[PDB]
Design an enzyme around this catalytic site. Structure first.
Site, PDB file in Angstrom:
ATOM      1  N   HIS A 127      -6.942  -4.834  11.168  1.00 39.43           N
ATOM      2  CA  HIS A 127      -5.671  -4.283  10.696  1.00 39.43           C
ATOM      3  C   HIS A 127      -5.180  -4.958   9.419  1.00 39.43           C
ATOM      4  CE1 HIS A 127      -4.654  -7.326  13.821  1.00 39.43           C
ATOM      5  NE2 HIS A 127      -3.735  -7.678  12.942  1.00 39.43           N
ATOM      6  N   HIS A 155      -1.366 -13.158   5.559  1.00 38.90           N
ATOM      7  CA  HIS A 155      -1.965 -11.845   5.470  1.00 38.90           C
ATOM      8  C   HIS A 155      -1.043 -10.958   4.631  1.00 38.90           C
ATOM      9  CE1 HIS A 155       0.779 -11.580   8.999  1.00 38.90           C
ATOM     10  NE2 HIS A 155       0.987 -10.395   8.500  1.00 38.90           N
ATOM     11  N   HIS A 203       0.189  -6.677   3.736  1.00 40.02           N
ATOM     12  CA  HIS A 203       0.334  -5.280   4.144  1.00 40.02           C
ATOM     13  C   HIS A 203       0.381  -4.559   2.804  1.00 40.02           C
ATOM     14  CE1 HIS A 203       1.454  -6.388   8.222  1.00 40.02           C
ATOM     15  NE2 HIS A 203       1.964  -7.399   7.569  1.00 40.02           N
ATOM     16  N   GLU A 247       6.595  -3.769   3.951  1.00 40.16           N
ATOM     17  CA  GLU A 247       7.222  -3.482   5.219  1.00 40.16           C
ATOM     18  C   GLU A 247       8.753  -3.464   5.089  1.00 40.16           C
ATOM     19  OE1 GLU A 247       5.052  -5.980   8.158  1.00 40.16           O
ATOM     20  OE2 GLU A 247       4.289  -4.013   8.548  1.00 40.16           O
ATOM     21  N   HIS A 256       2.859 -12.151   4.032  1.00 46.71           N
ATOM     22  CA  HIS A 256       3.513 -12.841   5.117  1.00 46.71           C
ATOM     23  C   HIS A 256       2.807 -14.142   5.380  1.00 46.71           C
ATOM     24  CE1 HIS A 256       4.891  -8.778   6.912  1.00 46.71           C
ATOM     25  NE2 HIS A 256       5.635  -9.225   5.952  1.00 46.71           N
ATOM     26  N   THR A 301       5.645  -7.649  13.088  1.00 44.53           N
ATOM     27  CA  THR A 301       5.661  -6.252  12.743  1.00 44.53           C
ATOM     28  C   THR A 301       4.390  -5.540  13.238  1.00 44.53           C
ATOM     29  OG1 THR A 301       4.712  -6.798  10.625  1.00 44.53           O
ATOM     30  CG2 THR A 301       7.150  -6.759  10.734  1.00 44.53           C
TER      31      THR A 301
HETATM   32 ZN   LIG Z   1       2.562  -9.116   8.424  1.00 44.50          ZN
END
Ligand SMILES: [Zn+2]
Ligand SMILES: [Hg+2]
Length: 255
Positions: free
Chosen positions: A60, A90, A92, A102, A115, A194
């Protein structure tokens, strides 16, 4: 769980009922409703003795993992009581440059969000810290497309090695300081992970200032795969959860 039509964010509540809970993340930060709180201490980011170990594609996102067996890379100050250890970071990101973060700011979406995950050392290890309302502190940094971020290039170049789910590569001596903006001004609110299991353990510290990365740097993120090797190719893009209702939480601003 995943980010597609049949297993994406709007389905998550069936397996993880906390998805509909009272302090879920991410949220929209309304800059005009956020309360300047002059009691907020400056953040203290001590990342000079950081030890990265490896980078991993987990299906992911890709995670850079750090040695958290001693206080080497720690966060304290700001809204926190105690020392929080860096365990991993990581990102997103989106399939297009106008989406991918996010958290949003006055509904503005950025191209990606970083993050940096830390756990409260009062609780002994990460697994115990995720059972606590103040067990984690996550530092969020927005990424916008512009000039290349030099400190991000080591990460971008290793991604070919971890194209598919389950691959990892050693990734030592990476200095996380090269991903920080100039200013450490921030917004902070109580929230959650999240991604599943979406536990409500997190003090979020979202920095006001974005960092810039080039179009070619963020394009390399988009070549990663959700699938494992030898499965049909599904590109890892848009691995972000939509904004959740704030539900009578207040966002405080350090500025
Ligand atoms: Zn994250
Ligand atoms: Hg928790």
């Amino acid at each position: 769980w995943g980010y597609g039509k049949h297993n994406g964010p709007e389905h998550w509540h069936k397996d993880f009922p906390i998805a509909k809970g009272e302090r879920q993340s991410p949220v929209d930060i309304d800059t005009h409703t956020a309360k300047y709180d002059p009691s907020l201490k400056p953040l203290s980011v001590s990342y000079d003795q950081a030890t990265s170990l490896r980078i991993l594609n987990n299906g992911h996102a890709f995670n850079v993992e750090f040695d958290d067996s001693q206080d080497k890379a720690v966060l304290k100050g700001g809204p926190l009581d105690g020392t929080y250890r860096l365990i991993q970071f990581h990102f997103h990101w989106g399939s297009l440059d106008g989406q991918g973060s996010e958290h949003t700011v006055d509904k503005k979406k950025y191209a990606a969000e970083l993050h940096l995950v830390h756990w409260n050392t009062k609780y002994g290890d990460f697994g115990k810290a995720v059972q606590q309302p103040d067990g984690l502190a996550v530092l969020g940094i927005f990424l916008k497309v512009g000039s290349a971020k030099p400190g991000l290039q080591k990460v971008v170049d290793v991604l070919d090695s971890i194209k598919t789910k389950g691959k990892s590569a050693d990734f030592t001596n990476f200095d996380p300081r090269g991903l920080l903006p100039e200013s450490l001004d921030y917004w902070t609110y109580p929230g959650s992970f999240t991604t599943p299991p979406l536990l409500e353990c997190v003090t979020w510290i979202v920095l006001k200032e974005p960092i810039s990365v080039s179009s070619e740097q963020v394009l390399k993120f988009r070549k990663l795969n959700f699938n494992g090797e030898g499965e049909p190719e599904e590109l890892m893009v848009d691995n972000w959860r939509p904004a959740q209702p704030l539900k009578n939480r207040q966002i405080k601003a350090s500025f």
